[PDB]
Design a protein around this ligand. Structure first.
Ligand SMILES: Cc1c(C(=O)N[C@@H](CCC2CC2)C(=O)Nc2ccc(C#N)cc2)[nH]c2c1C(=O)CC(C)(C)C2
Ligand SMILES: Cc1c(C(=O)N[C@@H](CCC2CC2)C(=O)Nc2ccc(C#N)cc2)[nH]c2c1C(=O)CC(C)(C)C2
Ligand SMILES: Nc1ncnc2c1ncn2[C@@H]1O[C@H](C[C@@H](N)CC[C@H](N)C(=O)O)[C@@H](O)[C@H]1O
Ligand SMILES: Nc1ncnc2c1ncn2[C@@H]1O[C@H](C[C@@H](N)CC[C@H](N)C(=O)O)[C@@H](O)[C@H]1O
Ligand SMILES: [Zn+2]
Ligand SMILES: [Zn+2]
Ligand SMILES: [Zn+2]
Ligand SMILES: [Zn+2]
Ligand SMILES: [Zn+2]
Ligand SMILES: [Zn+2]
Ligand SMILES: [Zn+2]
Ligand SMILES: [Zn+2]
Lengths: 274, 273
């Protein structure tokens, strides 16, 4: 079947680049059972602290590439290299919080510590996969450590998440201390709502602070964990919490030799304990 | 002969769509730094703007929002944008409702002028008699968006007690409590726009990515064709000058000046008759 292009830009011009949609698998048209938003939204108010006097900020008179940058120190160091990519030694299993520079800092808008707030730069495509519904793939090579996109949706409380019927787009912010919040991309979301789980993932989520530092509401940034080839599907590890629940209802279709959540893998992890 | 020096390549530090340089060919005054340049309004207490996406009025247009059927255009009061993004008015103050994240239209539709930011080239420069001012670096057709009045959102009760009121902009909320934008400590290029009795820009209230009626945003549009080099200015209003004329008079130098010593005396002469 021909790979028809069915939307020139699912983001309707809201991103720095278009995100087209194609389907060469079945007759499903472009997905429209949600509202594309490029930045997080609220229905009920979350009362995010946006008091500018509450911000920690730097006093740098350079490009914030020195070890003197107070915003880099809020994460030990600035984990961005000169090209805006995560460093090699960056912890990819236990990422630190990133504090980017903000409107209170003395530095310029193009300092070295503003990667996520500058938006999508790589060419992505929404496409129909063979076995996992819609997915997202790269239309270019992407070096390791490159910012891909943010997990964008509706900010909700943990209590609201628990009464939501469809949890297939629910991202837990993992607030360890105090009030717990989630991003639900079911009704409002961006391209990230279509990114599938891979047991051999090529992107990782990182918690980032930009225009506010209300620690209840980290923003979720995906960075590539290795070099990604053109045409390669993007995916992150949804985590054992997700699969511990969902695997009762469906198993992983990633098809990797390393797959941890397939029907075969589940049967092995069960036949063992027996 | 004193030469003009470029003393800052961009007072906005890269936050605007274009750089806004500062020059001084008048005196020894250094680039103004007794404030924090911000490109968007800030808060220093709980304002918590209502951004509930489900409560935004929005349109369903599948075109570029150029038709009269666009709900957002229909909500706008006594004004509209032409095909080039220029504001036309009837001349009750105008009120603009731009399209937003809830509308079905694209980010580049015809009802997105103010939210797309500064497009005209402006310069902060030292004036002869009015301190710093802002002038055009290009021809600006009538109705063109110039810049937004940006600063610290405060309640009118807080505005009543601020010590330096030289940068205080009253939003004049009709229904509900009144709020103000104070650009004294945090502000953008607009904090430097002087009063002119022959003004060439006008402030217009606008809603964009929220419709929290406490906080219209203030957008300046040209009220006539402006030539390169002309100082930009708006009418600060009689309420400003009724109070401030005790302390200083208007130095705009226009033959139409309303607030010089001579104009005030003449107005007092007219009232006495
Ligand atoms: C992967 C991850 C998450 C996360 O929420 N995943 C989602 C899966 C992906 C969403 C796109 C769906 C998840 O588990 N949903 C979920 C769980 C249970 C039920 C039920 N019944 C329903 C839905 N939260 C953090 C991570 C991290 O890697 C690190 C962190 C600090 C950013 C914190
Ligand atoms: C001009 C204007 C305003 C406005 O606040 N001006 C400022 C002057 C300019 C600021 C850049 C300084 C103003 O008066 N300050 C002020 C008044 C009294 C005292 C004392 N003691 C101190 C300071 N507010 C609207 C307008 C309009 O034209 C229409 C509107 C609907 C947008 C509503
Ligand atoms: N590895 C996977 N194996 C099977 N199904 C998956 C896998 N990854 C994602 N999915 C499906 O996609 C859902 C998660 C969505 N956030 C991803 C986009 C989804 N594919 C869609 O078409 O809307 C899951 O709840 C599954 O239904
Ligand atoms: N027409 C005017 N005549 C005299 N002073 C003016 C005039 N317009 C503005 N000013 C001065 O500028 C102040 C308002 C500021 N928002 C404008 C920028 C100011 N010129 C500065 O250098 O910072 C007023 O309180 C006056 O001190
Ligand atoms: Zn810094
Ligand atoms: Zn910086
Ligand atoms: Zn900083
Ligand atoms: Zn798998
Ligand atoms: Zn419309
Ligand atoms: Zn609209
Ligand atoms: Zn529109
Ligand atoms: Zn005057």
């Amino acid at each position: 079947r021909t790979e028809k292009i069915i939307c020139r830009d699912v983001a309707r011009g809201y991103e720095n680049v278009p995100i087209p949609c194609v389907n060469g698998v079945d007759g499903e048209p472009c997905p429209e059972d949600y509202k594309y938003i490029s930045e997080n939204c609220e229905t009920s108010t979350m009362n995010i602290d946006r008091n500018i006097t509450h911000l920690q900020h730097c006093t740098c008179v350079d490009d914030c590439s020195s070890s003197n940058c107070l915003c880099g120190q809020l994460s030990i160091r600035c984990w961005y290299d000169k090209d805006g990519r995560l460093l090699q030694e960056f912890n990819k299993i236990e990422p630190p919080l990133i504090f980017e520079c903000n409107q209170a800092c003395s530095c310029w808008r193009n300092c070295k510590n503003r990667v996520v707030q500058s938006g999508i730069k790589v060419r992505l495509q929404l496409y129909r996969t063979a076995k996992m519904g819609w997915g997202v793939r790269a239309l270019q090579t992407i070096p390791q450590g490159t910012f891909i996109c943010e997990y964008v949706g509706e900010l909700i409380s943990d209590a609201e998440a628990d009464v939501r019927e469809d949890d297939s787009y629910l991202f837990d912010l993992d607030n360890k201390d105090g009030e717990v919040y989630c991003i639900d991309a079911r009704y409002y979301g961006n391209i990230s709502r279509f990114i599938n789980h891979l047991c051999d993932p090529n992107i990782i989520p990182v918690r980032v602070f930009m225009l506010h530092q209300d620690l209840r509401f980290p923003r979720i940034a995906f960075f590539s964990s290795r070099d990604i080839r053109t045409g390669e599907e993007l995916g992150f590890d949804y985590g054992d919490r997700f699969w511990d629940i969902k695997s009762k209802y469906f198993t992983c279709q990633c098809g990797s030799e390393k797959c941890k959540h397939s029907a075969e893998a589940i049967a092995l992890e069960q036949s063992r304990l027996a």
